[PDB]
Amino acid sequence: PLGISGTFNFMIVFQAEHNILMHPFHQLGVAGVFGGALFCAMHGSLVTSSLIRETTETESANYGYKFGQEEETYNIVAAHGYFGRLIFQYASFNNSRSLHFFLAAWPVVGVWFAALGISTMAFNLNGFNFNHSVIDAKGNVINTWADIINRANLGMEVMHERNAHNFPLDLA
Amino acid sequence: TITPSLKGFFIGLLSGAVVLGLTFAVLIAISQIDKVQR
Amino acid sequence: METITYVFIFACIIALFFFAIFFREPPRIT
Amino acid sequence: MEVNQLGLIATALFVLVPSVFLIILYVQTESQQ
Amino acid sequence: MEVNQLGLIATALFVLVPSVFLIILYVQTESQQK
Amino acid sequence: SYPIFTVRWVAVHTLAVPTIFFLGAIAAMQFIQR
Amino acid sequence: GGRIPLWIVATVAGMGVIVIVGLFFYGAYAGLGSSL
Amino acid sequence: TTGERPFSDIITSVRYWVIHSITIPALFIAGWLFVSTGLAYDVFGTPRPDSYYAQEQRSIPLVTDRFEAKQQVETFLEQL
Amino acid sequence: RGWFDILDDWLKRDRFVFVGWSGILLFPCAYLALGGWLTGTTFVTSWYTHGLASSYLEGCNFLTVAVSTPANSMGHSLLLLWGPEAQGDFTRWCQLGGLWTFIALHGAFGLIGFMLRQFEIARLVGVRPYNAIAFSAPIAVFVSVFLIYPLGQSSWFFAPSFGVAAIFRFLLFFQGFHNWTLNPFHMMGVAGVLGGALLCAIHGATVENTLFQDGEGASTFRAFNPTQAEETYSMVTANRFWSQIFGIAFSNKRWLHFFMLFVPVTGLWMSAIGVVGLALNLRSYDFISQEIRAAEDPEFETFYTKNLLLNEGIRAWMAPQDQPHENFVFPEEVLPRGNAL
Amino acid sequence: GLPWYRVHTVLINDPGRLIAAHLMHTALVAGWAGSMALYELATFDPSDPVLNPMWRQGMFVLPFMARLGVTGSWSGWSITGETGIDPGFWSFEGVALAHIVLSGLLFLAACWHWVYWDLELFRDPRTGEPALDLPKMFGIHLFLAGLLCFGFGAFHLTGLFGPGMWVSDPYGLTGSVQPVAPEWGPDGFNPYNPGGVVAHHIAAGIVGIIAGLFHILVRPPQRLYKALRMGNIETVLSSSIAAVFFAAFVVAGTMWYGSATTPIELFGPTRYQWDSSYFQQEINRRVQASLASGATLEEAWSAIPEKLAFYDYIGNNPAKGGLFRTGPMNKGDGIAQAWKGHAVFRNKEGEELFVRRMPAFFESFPVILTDKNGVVKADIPFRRAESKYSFEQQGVTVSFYGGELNGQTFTDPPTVKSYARKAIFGEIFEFDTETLNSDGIFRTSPRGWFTFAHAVFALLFFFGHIWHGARTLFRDVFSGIDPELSPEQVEWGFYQKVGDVTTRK
Amino acid sequence: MEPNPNRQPVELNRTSLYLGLLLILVLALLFSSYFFN
Amino acid sequence: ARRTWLGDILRPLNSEYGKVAPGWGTTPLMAVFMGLFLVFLLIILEIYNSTLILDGVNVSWKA
Ligand code: CLA
Ligand code: CLA
Ligand code: CLA
Ligand code: CLA
Ligand SMILES: CC1=C(/C=C/C(C)=C/C=C/C(C)=C/C=C/C=C(C)/C=C/C=C(C)/C=C/C2=C(C)CCCC2(C)C)C(C)(C)CCC1
Ligand SMILES: CC1=C(/C=C/C(C)=C/C=C/C(C)=C/C=C/C=C(C)/C=C/C=C(C)/C=C/C2=C(C)CCCC2(C)C)C(C)(C)CCC1
Ligand SMILES: CCCCCCCCCCCCO[C@@H]1O[C@H](CO)[C@@H](O[C@H]2O[C@H](CO)[C@@H](O)[C@H](O)[C@H]2O)[C@H](O)[C@H]1O
Ligand SMILES: CCCCCCCS[C@@H]1O[C@H](CO)[C@@H](O)[C@H](O)[C@H]1O
Ligand SMILES: O=C1C=C(Cl)C(=O)C(Cl)=C1
Ligand code: OEX
């Protein structure tokens, strides 16, 4: 639906019918947007951390950059000297082009997989199903966290569109 | 008097003191041997 | 009253779009 | 709809007070030499 | 007392809109080069 | 002329030694039947 | 310190990872956790 | 370039693989036996497949007392 | 000079893995938090706290293993190994959920250590510590979700358990019980995370597609030198492109990169505030005017009333197994269900 | 020019106008306290401390006045329900007026310190530059804080020269202001022991006096002066923000879990009292003791105080509210009028059945009735076609003991079902829902709103601590890094010790 | 009265105005539903 | 700058800006009090938490 609560309705019904949380393409999606947000904050903080002093203590440091100036406004060698010591030296991007390629690629690839998640659950190839996967020596079901998810999914399933189903299986 | 959980509290306190004590003793000893050269 | 309030804020945002685009501080090279 | 009556004044001041603060600062910036 | 509910917003805007108009003009007068 | 036991050496092995032990454990588990 | 070529190490090490992960996927279908 | 021997130098040397052709499989086998002997179950108190329930029990042995919990698991375990 | 200065020297030596004063806190607590999680997910059950299997040893896979919270009857006990619950018994301690507070508390102090590391290194190399400042958002999320939220609730039991599927359950619980998607502080978090991912993608793509030709290779990565003075891409061309495509563009590179810090960091801080409210069940659960209208007018329906029916299903169908200490028995006839399903 | 988020930095080098700004802030806070008390006095109904106490009425500052001994009004009432009391000047109204007058005086002092900013006191005698000796200022202020802390404990809280503090029985039935003697044994550290609060302020005050004298007389070590940048007033802001968010987390915690300083007659019951059926257990204890002494069921339940029953009701649980459900609890379920009495449900066989109570987690909850062993015996079904436990099939009745409905029995299934729905909330009350146009939706108490604001503010002040601590320790690079910063200082291998030019190889 | 040497001019450029108004108006569009409730 | 009667009286209290004790001074003593305080906070926390349980200390409304 084209609306805020309608979006939540679509998400909750999707989880009931496809177990999208247990689908690896949605998980890649989450890594895409969590990682995009992380690296956004990381890049922003590292460039901001290494701005070259061009201003006085009172004025905004943004005055230290003039639109269209040819010189880069931060010292990437200093930023990478910090970040390489935060992790280890080779985990850091010294090459700005490689860095900015990674900044583009990580969220774009993750969100591609998110889109493909929806587009393949569109044909009912659903998230992993481990309902009753663990069984004891007698045959008693030993629940896992997957089974608790299933119980929540059931509550969504039996309540959604409460007057629309006449037959026992929701087949689309 | 001294309850079992007070005894356990002392075990926790002493255990933490030892872990901290040994760590700083090892670090200080290592630092004295391998001195930076100026 | 609530509908009027929601549509008023939305309308102000669209007006803001127009000024932010067409009456922006022009970028100048240096 | 039975909405809260104070919602209108709450929203109006929420917009107007910080917006006028910014307008005051912007205009006195433009008028500086 | 059963007062008109719009009385509050009417009074608030009646004070704030013209007061702010004057404050804008005063402050930008003070900031002009002296 | 390189040293052998360094800060890096310890950090590597505090991670690598348990990882191999654990991987041996998890491998054995693949043959447990109820 | 150089006698063993880096491409053989990378190939052998990569193959070991595939073997061990393959075993973990095999175990998803047999014994505990297999639902059977 | 901080003074330590490069990893590429290390993992392509014969001495490295002489050492670790012993240590890596030994750790792997030690971890295997930790499971295959059942010792992992007893160290961590994890139920074996025949130990989640008694034969006719239908109730999970949930801990319900904060300070007698240690003794509660001991009683649940002795009923198996 | 003295031993403190000698110790300071050795701590701050340039080496493959920088140690520092902050490392004395960071490395043990990070290692123990990670080791605790691997230990628990490999070997440790949740039978006695949740009635759940949760380890590889029991047959779980990477998606369903967890280190689970202690039983609700533990309350907010610190659950120290030497404490009055385990009394030094390592095995009992694992069965009681001791690994959960172990991971949460060492994890918290590890996070303190990591942010101290960011300050300490920034100070040593001479940069402003905005990276540490940005890290305050991860810390606000961790502290609000794993500490404040359960501290407002009945016990650690209702904190997130440390596992993939366990976290998914936490999401779904928050929908059904808290109507968390309706919460304006969560919505701001979403905007900050999604807007952050957008900024990440659009900035990386823009730089890469306004590069100057600084080399002859068709693969353009080699044509950069970190010490070079010149911008590697054209800010003027990027600005014109976005001005004509989208209507507005960045023109100040310092503002751009500050904005990239600001957006996801502020989003996470906002979500943390909403969770502090949920610690007290102080939810954005309902719109009172919707409920009054819907109660009096049985033909009135919105997506908001539809979602509450879903929440009511989640609560009734998940609570007996999700909250076993409550001993819920809901006879079939009381379960909310639509037609047929 | 300064950007908008930096305008207040003009005070950093101006001790006189910093004091003026602090005076103005103090004037506003005192002025808020006075206005808030007046607004509460204009809206507070004092006529029923049993079923309409302050915490049902959205009262936020009234309990803080009561906590420390202000319990009466100039108009003759007291919050313990007395009439015709003489509070003297220090009634709620006198407190409000005193804060308003303080606000005005502080405002005037701010004007003076703003105009006369250039006092020779604020100039370093040697350099002529603005200068504050922050280490000695700390000693002076800490010594003063110690004195005041000691006096508060030794005189006000003891009742030796002062009124004492609010104390109550474990079930919040007989609260009043009393003198409290200090507790010097280990029970003084029990959060529910009020004597520990007295002992705290005596001992902490004396420690503050001694430490204050130390900080007046001993200069900071050079090592610590340099490391904490003790010539920089922003270091004080950093550590002060840290102390303040520590304090704010503590008061959030003691408000939510309860202590001798967050009494339930002033702030309402806690959520944990519902979780543990704290009041239900005490009610049941009294009823079984009444029965053992030969009382009838009606007499036993009629001996239960309405105030005790009212605590055993989920509408007073602070974990039942909503972020945007504003106002007093009375705006939700209504103004409580009377206990209806204890509902006892029975099936046609005459077995007593018990309604399963609603846990705080649940916005809604089914109606399920069990026997004394927890076996399900009746419910209100959703689907009807396979119902087995309906009140109609099971012949469920309800009889009331105590309260308004004492001695009455209901058999009409819709009426019985209506009382069972109320019983999931605990004891059943009659409410006036008309006076406030109550909407029937639960709200939290002052205990909940206090906890929320202070945990939120505490978390935000963590960011403030991080920000100003960073500004303090990195002041030399606030505008950026050195334009001719040595590349060898950030690359690997040139220096043995990171960032130490004297360790180059 | 002698002039205070700590005074500074304050600035807000047009972009900051647009950014601030956007923040304010969007926050209002978001929170207004909850104020009306 | 302006002298006042009150300013002249308070002047010595704001005269030692920048004055320090040599070296580490009382840092060791300060560290001792910091450790005692840390143990103290740990004690009251564990009493409140019911991790430390003492005779005659019933952490409940019932005391
Ligand atoms: C610096 C790193 C660090 C930090 C911050 C922590 C922190 C913690 N650990 Mg971890 N731990 C560490 C390293 C660390 N640990 C290491 C290296 C090991 C392996 C040995 C462990 C193994 C471990 C286990 C097995 C457990 C913990 C637990 C804990 C928690 C409770 C600790 C406590 O109460 O001690 C209190 C001790 C102190 C505060 C020491 C301070 C002493 C002061 C400064 C001086 C006082 C000295 C004293 C007077 C000496 C005399 C004692 C006498 C009176 C008896 C706490 C979060 C417990 C837990 O997580 O429960 C869920 C737990 O069960 N730790
Ligand atoms: C002139 C003295 C004076 C007196 C006798 C009062 C009295 C009162 N005030 Mg008012 N007030 C005053 C001045 C005064 N006020 C000033 C100057 C302000 C502006 C800041 C206010 C702003 C104010 C507000 C906003 C409120 C009151 C309230 C009240 C009432 C409750 C008091 C309370 O709970 O505080 C509790 C005080 C504390 C818990 C003190 C915390 C101290 C921390 C822990 C100090 C840590 C710092 C220290 C240096 C640490 C080291 C200590 C050392 C000993 C070791 C009580 C009638 C309340 C009320 O009912 O309003 C109607 C209320 O909400 N007052
Ligand atoms: C510590 C702060 C505090 C607390 C805990 C209380 C508590 C209480 N107040 Mg008091 N009050 C306060 C301060 C406080 N007050 C102040 C400062 C004023 C002057 C405005 C008042 C004036 C006042 C009045 C007039 C009344 C109360 C009433 C009450 C009671 C009901 C509260 C309620 O419905 O809240 C509802 C809370 C909310 C709706 C939450 C608001 C959250 C905001 C909107 C979020 C903003 C987000 C922000 C824009 C995000 C920016 C993002 C950006 C960084 C990108 C409750 C006991 C009522 C009462 O019953 O009196 C008897 C009442 O009528 N209070
Ligand atoms: C004792 C508390 C305290 C004090 C005295 C200061 C003081 C200062 N701050 Mg810090 N800070 C604090 C806590 C504090 N801060 C907290 C809790 C946070 C996290 C929210 C911050 C985050 C912070 C940042 C990110 C920055 C500062 C900056 C500054 C300096 C300039 C402030 C300014 O000109 O704002 C001018 C403010 C406005 C013109 C309007 C602000 C409107 C706010 C957002 C909404 C309305 C607030 C409302 C009236 C507050 C009610 C009271 C509240 C407690 C309930 C000044 C030294 C700035 C700096 O370092 O400059 C060099 C700076 O960038 N502070
Ligand atoms: C808890 C505790 C402790 C600790 C311990 C520890 C510290 C441990 C550690 C441990 C460890 C340290 C372990 C490890 C493990 C590891 C592992 C188990 C791994 C695995 C891996 C894998 C499986 C891989 C996968 C993959 C990926 C990830 C990607 C792609 C590729 C692949 C797929 C292959 C102590 C004693 C102190 C005390 C008591 C308690
Ligand atoms: C001058 C003078 C005088 C007078 C005085 C007066 C009359 C005063 C008043 C005062 C006042 C009357 C004051 C008031 C104040 C208030 C305030 C200051 C408030 C604030 C508020 C706030 C800040 C809020 C916020 C918020 C909101 C709005 C929403 C929710 C959230 C929050 C809470 C944040 C006299 C006669 C004495 C004489 C001397 C001189
Ligand atoms: C209900 C909402 C109300 C919100 C109210 C917000 C109030 C905001 C007050 C802003 C005050 C601005 O303060 C104003 O700053 C400008 C500079 O910026 C000063 O201007 C000064 O500097 C400028 C520039 O160097 C000189 O040209 C000018 O001659 C000089 O007087 C003004 O003397 C002062 O009046
Ligand atoms: C139809 C049965 C008799 C009427 C209902 C008896 C249950 S009790 C009933 O509950 C109401 C809230 O619904 C309160 O507002 C009211 O004070 C109280 O009488
Ligand atoms: O290694 C780096 C990683 C990131 Cl995300 C950066 O922004 C920079 Cl400048 C260097
Ligand atoms: O429409 Mn919308 O949701 Ca897809 O499933 Mn079938 O159909 Mn209805 O149900 Mn479930």
Ligand SMILES: [Cl-]
């Ligand atoms: Cl159908």
Ligand SMILES: [Mg+2]
């Ligand atoms: Mg298997």
